[model samples]
Target: VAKREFIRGMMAHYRASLPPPEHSVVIHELQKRVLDIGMLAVNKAHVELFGSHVSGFCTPHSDADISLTYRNFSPWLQGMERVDEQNNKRMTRFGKEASAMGMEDVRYIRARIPVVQFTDGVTGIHCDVSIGNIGGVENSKILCAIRQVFPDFYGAYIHLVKAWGKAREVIAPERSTFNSFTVTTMALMVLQELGLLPVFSKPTGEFGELTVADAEMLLQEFKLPPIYDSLHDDDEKLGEAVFFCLQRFAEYYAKYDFSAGTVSLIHPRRHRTVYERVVRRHLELLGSRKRLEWEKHIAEHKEDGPLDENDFSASMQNETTQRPSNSPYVVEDFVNYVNCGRRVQASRVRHIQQEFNRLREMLIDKESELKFDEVFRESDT
Candidate 1:
């Protein structure tokens, strides 16, 4: 009982850190309710959330998404049965309450496709959970570690992606979930618009403006799929899907210029802080000089064009902006960089030439093996 209450407290605290006006009460209640439900189905489970709510883009319209990962499938289910016997009385209670409130969309919930829907009487949320063993646990930790250590690159990538949803005027966010690919692609798009790199071969919507190639290559190398293809299906040709998505990526970003014609190129040195830190740690632990070489290759390839405006004249010469005020951030920053306001120009190009390069490094080196036991140490309870 004490443990449960403590967990609930933690839940409230975490939810509070989220964007303001959090449904804290509901978040706490849901955590408990889901645990109760899980107690009946699985022996051991850990629940987490992904998507917009955590990403700082959640609005009042946003729906909560949850994921549950189970261990010891059979024993966990038995434990859950005992929990139900001691608490919920039976599953009928949930159904009756759901029906009373017109929650016909979901009668009861189950974790199957890694994503599930849950509602708290008013807002609807989708939650996804998965099953994992020892190896899977390590992989998840790696992902979490990557996010924690290199937050700038990852954070900026996430920000750029959420911005994509805002720019496209898409539907209200039912799920705030986006994977690494979304972040990488959007970063590429923003970079390309600034003339920081060459334009990608894909487009996001009708916009011809695209993200830079280096970023896309990085994401691809990191194994994050680009956004142009259908994520819902896998029955048809994989090549067709890949090509189509790539084409759309090039098409949407190339013409759109979502940056609203900002200055070309991002300052490169700051970007390396996270990647270099990760590489150093990997080298120290794994004792792999090859990884260091890989990092060097990425570093060497980062530069594409001049960092000054006068040198960038050729690229900015054709300022065909439909609305020069499209990107306030871009406009403001470019003005600050060039010391010019309400004016546009043609300039030579300088770009990052890559977006998710670190990620790409991960995807390409299939030979690499990172063992959890080798690097991770947990308290022996």
Candidate 2:
């Protein structure tokens, strides 16, 4: 439950600045339904809003989610008892009805629809609705335990995140992308890689943000063994073992960066022979190919081009600006390009890649300088 508690605190800080209660009531309604339904079966549940909603990058039309997590394993099975014929039928019908009730206003109803149901069905919402134990109730406890340990870094980081939320609300409005949540995620990822934070899957509270005692207890509860890092380098597995070499290379690259902003947030400029694999793979999964082709067309322009790369630079120069012009070369590709392409262009795509890279380096340097500056003053204390 420590881990869960930590997540709650983390989420609360994120939700500290959002729409009013009247404008968004789906989460509350969903919680009510979960409690009412779970009680009949002696089950307990909670919700964790992930994706765009929790990230605070959600737009007016963005969907809201409320996860229903059962307190006990037995109750989870009770909800899942009927697995054959009407698997998610009960959940589905309830979701639509709940949405209608929660969002009573026409504007909200038109732009944002709220729903409550078993977390199954449909392609999963980026916003997760956890209705079962988060791996186990012990996870939440583990979180609390860790928070007790990491009082300096992770603890302070949370406060910084809170500040980021405030800044975004003040500086950027009606502009979801290229905002503070995105920036925070990047900063957090950098911290993790620097060994200042735990790896993505592994929880770290002993380092001052999470208490050692809680983390130790949670480790026992989860029945996980102490983790150790070992170096693995092989010889004689070179040219002859071509497949193995390729597999190893792929795995290495895949595990290279688990940070938040590691993903290329912008679009690519020129095709590179070496990077073709990534570009091709991304293209294959392009949610909207029609939109991508249109972007490709627009990016290929000279002067008569509809959108200029310079326009994107101008926007980024002003931190308050929401994002680069998201309109694609084709009118139909708005959603596809806005959501993914822009991120790639800003972070990965080569168009603004150099400038973005410079910005990231500068931010890191600034953070480091601030750390040293504080240390220099602390010499007196």
Candidate 3:
């Protein structure tokens, strides 16, 4: 009983950190600003929002992800072109319009996906506008649907980790640290590992493109009540879930074998064959490539590094292995799989591990004290 109460106290503290309804109204206003930018243009492009807002997991002041899709791409872009004496391209359509409309710090970035990023000076809201990133839109919807079934227990864990990460300054992916997505993925993996959530199996049949509404509607047919039942058990308690999941979370990262160079949260036997065939090989290639570059630089530059001639030669031997065949699969090597240039430096990761270790110990120490007292009382009787 003491353990349960302590767990609830911790859960309550995290729940309090969540944004109120008024804060969500601010997000809605920001969304309108994004949509209005689309309406202001001659091309009459359409815009949609994605990310934490759509996923129903956003905290106060999170950046808004808005994507614009133009009806006639080339013509629309050409229409925004401004003439200069030297004939240099000055700015993109998004930048030109956003700046004219008084958006702050509007900069156009042409990466793999072209984006115009800015901040709303009035609301102080950060926004990213991407061109034709439908995958981002679709992913947001899928996350929202998955979130509905898990309920508040899952949400608390996600929120807690995100809040903790942000506080520690280790949550900004743009700064070479883990993003909310990676942190949330780690939380989900912990839940899945603890049987708090079921191992997600890839769907066998798919007719075509699917939507969040479609997924939520079909959930009942999939017979997922058992998964939620575990979550909803009154005797089981949310506090216990929080403690166990976090305890396991700390353990997983602390004891993780970097030398093995593989991290998988998927159940071992459930999808062993499909998992290795699709996910494992992709990870091997990416991890090996990164390792090779890192090692090569160090070997050439440093007097003392971890590569001898024999070890270096052994690493070269696996370079010619056949690439893994592709197939439809679900979350596999999920942390690395969903990563979009967010790599936590070793120092930050170490700090994060230590924090969780302290958190785990704090809870355990309280529970241990209670048990110790009860044992002493029983002996006296």
Candidate 4:
């Protein structure tokens, strides 16, 4: 029972209810309460906040995430079975204690980093607690920094895109479905292409080449980059920019080939030479794996690697004439080149394409009543 008005309204709610301002005291209070609960359940645990709660794009439906700084744990412990076992043991105890304390749906998911998840019975806020995921903490910090540079229109654009994913039922749960990170990264990609927001940049909105020790300084030093006269994100053009953003998003993914092509957003933000090398090598490896599997018939496969300029615009200009990369989709972590879409199912991939198609079509031919509710809502479940 809505048209473009649906999008405008969602933007209004996001502005009124979420971050970049207060009236979000509820989430902050829950952050402290969640920290208390985590510390109480797990022995001597140093609990801290991360994820969508810190990232500015959180909707009211979003979950709050916490990370443990216990025992001076390192972020990566892949081969350390003892560490995994320790995390598992602690999570089991934490889950039981949380359940007894009136937390609903308490469950421990055996991820790379062990996660105990639950909902606060009093506030209906879902929370995830993970052990020693410093990478996730850093990622969320980077997102907060990136939020500093985003234009005001993004407050609504990102939220609508999220609800778009949720309503279409393409984004939900973890493992085998598109999480907020993947979909959020995709939305960012649209802006990246259109010269809206810079990729995961620091306060100054410029690429920095430095040591890991030096680059970590970014966590503390992020601020808003100075705006230029060329970019038109003012209130006068707000509607045009916002509407254009969704149009481009739908067009980009609707026609995107998930079978062979990837949504490789791992480019830009070359803060370290090793990072650039690692991502470049990974792209090469991805191409090698693709050719090794079945694409040997095609003469050659080349993945667009690190650019001399480290620019999303220049990179996307090349992407305007696309190619099939090694992976089906590569919406990566800016720091860790881990593919977010790795666990996404093929059927769901098709479903995503279909939804984007419907969205693109709707944007093209104006639908008077625009059943955006149907577009973004789960099927009366």
> Best candidate, lDDT-wise?
4
Clash counts per candidate, in order, are 70, 44, 0, 3
Q: How close is candidate 2 to the true structure, as a TM-score?
A: 0.32
Among all candidates shown, the one with the greatest TM-score: 4
Candidate 3 regions exceeding 4 Å error are: 1-9, 22-26, 72-91, 110-112, 203-237, 257-342, 345-356, 365-381
Per residue, candidate 3 scores C-alpha lDDT tens digits across 84-135 of 1001221265678788878999888754235678988667668888665565
| Least accurate 10 contiguous residues by lDDT in model 2 | 327-336
User: What ranking emerges by TM-score with the best candidate at the front?
Assistant: 4, 3, 2, 1
Error of 3 at 265 (Å): 7.1
* Model 1 regions more than 4 Å off: 1-18, 21-28, 73-104, 107-115, 128-185, 188-252, 255-381
lDDT of each structure?
Answer: 0.33, 0.32, 0.54, 0.60
- lDDT value for candidate 1? 0.33
User: What is the lDDT ranking, best to worst?
Assistant: 4, 3, 1, 2
Query: Which structure is stronger by lDDT: 1 or 4?
Result: 4
Better of 1 and 3 by lDDT: 3
